[PDB]
């Protein structure tokens, strides 16, 4: 099975006249074996366009953001979702945003509903008087299996 969500922020966060604005990728998971892939463009991958981009959490996908009160808090994903396994590598590179892409697959059984987030934020980059956009991933997990 090659079921896969892809949040590709490459052409979503480039500086434009209306920027900065929020680009949201909503990931709805209520089936087993769903793979999630998030592409966050690297600083310097293209000249000027991502000079001040930023990804949160740095330890994604092992660490994610979750909403406590109004405050986003970093939490271990393996704590929120028991039985989660993360591939150490993705296409022979470290599974970390520092390589430009992260991936993870949720386990075949999830008992508790959970929502967590990633951030790929280019709103602090300026080029030709235009500002980049702020990207956000929301993973919505419903119990399944």
């Amino acid at each position, epitope marked *: 099975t090659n079921k896969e*969500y892809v949040c590709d922020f490459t052409d979503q966060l480039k500086p434009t006249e209306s920027g900065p604005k929020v680009k949201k990728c909503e990931v709805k998971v209520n089936e087993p074996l769903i793979k999630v892939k998030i592409i966050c463009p690297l600083k310097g991958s293209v000249e000027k366009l991502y000079d001040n981009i930023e990804y949160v959490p740095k330890k994604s996908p092992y660490v994610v953001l979750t909403k406590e009160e109004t405050k986003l808090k970093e939490k271990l994903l393996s704590k929120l979702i028991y039985g989660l396994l993360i591939s150490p590598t993705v296409n022979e590179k470290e599974n970390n945003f520092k390589e430009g892409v992260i991936e993870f697959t949720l386990p075949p059984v999830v008992h508790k509903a959970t929502v967590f987030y990633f951030i790929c934020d280019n709103s602090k980059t300026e080029d030709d008087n235009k500002k980049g956009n702020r990207g956000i991933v929301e993973v919505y997990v419903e119990p399944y299996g």
Partner: nanobody, 124 residues
Framework: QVQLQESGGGLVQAGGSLRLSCAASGRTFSDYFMGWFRQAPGKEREFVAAVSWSGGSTYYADSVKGRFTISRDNAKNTVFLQMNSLKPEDTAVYYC?????????????????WGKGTQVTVSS
């Protein structure tokens, strides 16, 4: 490979309902996130709705959310688009599509197969 064929289009009155269907050939239907797109007169083609591999999750364009609903029958290789409270602005050619990967921020990006479309005309 996979071929998609839409059916169910026709003339409807404003305020009515119409259900579209889309059949897929082969034996890999559940490998595909399925979706509906449309092209209205004088416009570019736009996203309408999508339904996940198992049928468990659905996405809807803001222009139709609440009025249209999508579902699938993996035992019959069919996707359905239920339209309620049809408006003249819903007149369009409706296109079926599918792909193994789904791009929520840009739903056309992951589509690898496309039907030929079926016309829906809403008169008032």
């Amino acid at each position: 490979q996979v071929q998609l064929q839409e059916s169910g289009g026709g003339l409807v009155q404003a305020g009515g309902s119409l259900r579209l269907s889309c059949a897929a050939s082969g034996r890999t239907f559940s490998d595909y996130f399925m979706g509906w797109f449309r092209q209205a007169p004088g416009k570019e083609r736009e996203f309408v709705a999508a339904v996940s591999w198992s049928g468990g999750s659905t996405y809807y364009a803001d222009s139709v959310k609440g009025r249209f609903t999508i579902s699938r029958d993996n035992a019959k290789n069919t996707v359905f688009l239920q339209m309620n409270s049809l408006k003249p602005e819903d007149t369009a050619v409706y296109y079926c599509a599918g792909g193994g990967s789904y791009y929520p921020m840009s739903p056309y990006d992951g589509m690898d197969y496309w039907g030929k479309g079926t016309q829906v005309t809403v008169s008032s």
